[PDB]
Amino acid sequence: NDEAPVFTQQQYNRLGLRETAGIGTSVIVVRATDKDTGDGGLVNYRILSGAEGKFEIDESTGLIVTVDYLDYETKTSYLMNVSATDGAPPFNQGFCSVYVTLLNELDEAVQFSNASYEAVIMENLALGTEIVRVQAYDIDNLNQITYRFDAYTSAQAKALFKIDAITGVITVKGLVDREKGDFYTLTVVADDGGPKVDSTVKVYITVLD
Ligand SMILES: [Ca+2]
Ligand SMILES: [Ca+2]
Ligand SMILES: [Ca+2]
Ligand code: NA
Numbered sequence: 001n002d003e004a005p006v007f008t009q010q011q012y013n014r015l016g017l018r019e020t021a022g023i024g025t026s027v028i029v030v031r032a033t034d035k036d037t038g039d040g041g042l043v044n045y046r047i048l049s050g051a052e053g054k055f056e057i058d059e060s061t062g063l064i065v066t067v068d069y070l071d072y073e074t075k076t077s078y079l080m081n082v083s084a085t086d087g088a089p090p091f092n093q094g095f096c097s098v099y100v101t102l103l104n105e106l107d108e109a110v111q112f113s114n115a116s117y118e119a120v121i122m123e124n125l126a127l128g129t130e131i132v133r134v135q136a137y138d139i140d141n142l143n144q145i146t147y148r149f150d151a152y153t154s155a156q157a158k159a160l161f162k163i164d165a166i167t168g169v170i171t172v173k174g175l176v177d178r179e180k181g182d183f184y185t186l187t188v189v190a191d192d193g194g195p196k197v198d199s200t201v202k203v204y205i206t207v208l209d
Contacts, residue, residue, distance in 0.1 A: 004092030005032035005043045005084040012096060016103040019072040027055060027064040032084035032094050042087035043094075050080040050097070057082065070102055073139065077101040108139035110190045110199040117203040125172045131161070134168040134201060136190035143192045150187040150200060157184045161205070170203060182207045 034041040078100040119132040147168040162173040186203040
């Protein structure tokens, strides 16, 4: 027991670890010195709490790495308790903690302001009349949404309506004639500039005599 291990820092800090970091990514290196000779000065590294199944420490190297995927939107930061135990009886311990905070990156989809949208209009509505407004909210809270009609929205309905790529306001583009169509189901995509499979909503437009 001549002395116990002392880490080089009380709290280690890794700030802005990318949440989309891959498995095995280097997080931070800890180090506890023990100036006893032989096995009394040889320390074994271990996490006691706080990693929540996302981090693993090398017992010998003291390197911490990730061990599955991270998520800013599920947990923004981690505080792990680490021990260093010397290699001979009586296995004296030393202690630190490790603070990891995550960098929010654009890896999530988008929510809309309702389940769907509806508009009831009359024939021969003037051009550029506002019909309804689609609005959506980047889950990631990084980007603004851009709005467009999806690929499968019909030529006929692309001729009659236009959505604003910024405001998401749908306006009258051409002349709505009842006999040509009294009801339209539009599909609006909200793009966040991100990866995800496209977030869409329905707009149901009804035309009256
Ligand atoms: Ca010792
Ligand atoms: Ca995320
Ligand atoms: Ca994110
Ligand atoms: Na998003």
